[PDB]
Amino acid sequence: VNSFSGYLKLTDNVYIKNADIVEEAKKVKPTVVVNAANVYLKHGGGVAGALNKATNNAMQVESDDYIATNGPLKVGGSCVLSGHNLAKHCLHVVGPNVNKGEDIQLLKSAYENFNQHEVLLAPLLSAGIFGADPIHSLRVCVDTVRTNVYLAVFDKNLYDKLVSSFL
Ligand SMILES: Cc1ccccc1C[C@H](CO)Nc1ncnc2[nH]ccc12
């Protein structure tokens, strides 16, 4: 039993809700919140910009030190950093950005990072400003993640379509 509330159950391990991931994180304080990161950990817009803003830019300061030490992530890769005031940890995961020409096949690799954590709050990877079809992102999620994932989806019109079209 966990404190996630109001989710629809898609599968044995995947749950989905129309919600602002920032507001959800502040309520649940999950062990792991997933960020929709880029390889530079430059948290400008979308989920990343919103999470970082909610940390008063502390996420960005920490991320800049991470990059200065380790260099960029890989597309499909991830790193674990602090969750600041939002969660214990933030798993920064880089899905492919279709608007940068990156290989959508990398989306499965991106979701595989979730399997290293027993429970996560997360957005749909590569959706939104990363340019991929969110229906496809949900499918890859369900077919790749085996741990317990609570998906937030901020956009209301997007949520209803994802539920109604789910196979
Ligand atoms: C995946 C992605 C990345 C970048 C931009 C937009 C999206 C699409 C999703 C679904 O709507 N966005 C969000 N999902 C949950 N919590 C959110 N909080 C603020 C935005 C937001």
Helix content: 25-40%
Biggest β-sheet description: 4 strands, mixed
CATH superfamily: Leucine Aminopeptidase, subunit E, domain 1
- Trace the largest sheet across and list its strands: 1-2-7-6
CATH classification, class level:
Alpha Beta
Q: Helix- and strand-based class?
A: alpha/beta
| Radius of gyration, in angstroms, nearest whole number | 14 Å
**CATH fold category name:** Leucine Aminopeptidase, subunit E, domain 1
**β-sheet strand percentage:** 15-25%
- Total strands: the figure is 7
End-to-end separation in angstroms reads: 26 Å
Give the domain tally. Answer: 1
CATH structural architecture? 3-Layer(aba) Sandwich
Shape: globular
What molecules are bound to this protein?
ligand A1A9S
User: What's the SSE pattern?
Assistant: EEHEHHEEHEHEH
PDB class: viral protein, hydrolase
Keywords: Macrodomain, ADP-ribose, SARS-CoV-2, fragment-based drug discovery, viral protein, Hydrolase
Assembly: monomeric
Entry title: PanDDA analysis group deposition -- Crystal structure of SARS-CoV-2 NSP3 macrodomain in complex with AVI-0003674
How is this structure best described in words?
The chain contains six helices and seven strands; from the N terminus they run ββαβααββαβαβα. With 167 residues, the protein is α/β, with parallel strands linked by helices. A hairpin with a 4-residue loop joins strand 1 and strand 2 (14-18). The chain has helices at residues 21-28, 46-54, 58-70, 106-112, 134-144, 156-164, and strands at 8-9, 14-18, 32-36, 78-82, 89-93, 119-122, 148-153. The strands form two sheets. A four-stranded mixed β-sheet has the order 1-2-7-6, sandwiched between helices. It has a three-stranded mixed β-sheet with strand order 3-5-4, covered by helices on one side. The protein starts with 7 loop residues before the first strand and ends with a helix. Helix 4 (106-112) crosses helix 5. The protein has one domain (8-163): Leucine Aminopeptidase, subunit E, domain 1 (3-Layer(aba) Sandwich), CATH 3.40.220. Helices cover 34% and strands 19% of the residues. The structure holds the ligand Cc1ccccc1C[C@H](CO)Nc1ncnc2[nH]ccc12. Ligand A1A9S binds next to helix 1, helix 2 and strand 7. May form homohexamers. Interacts with N protein. It catalyses: Thiol-dependent hydrolysis of ester, thioester, amide, peptide and isopeptide bonds formed by the C-terminal Gly of ubiquitin (a 76-residue protein attached to proteins as an intracellular targeting signal). It is found in: Host endoplasmic reticulum membrane.
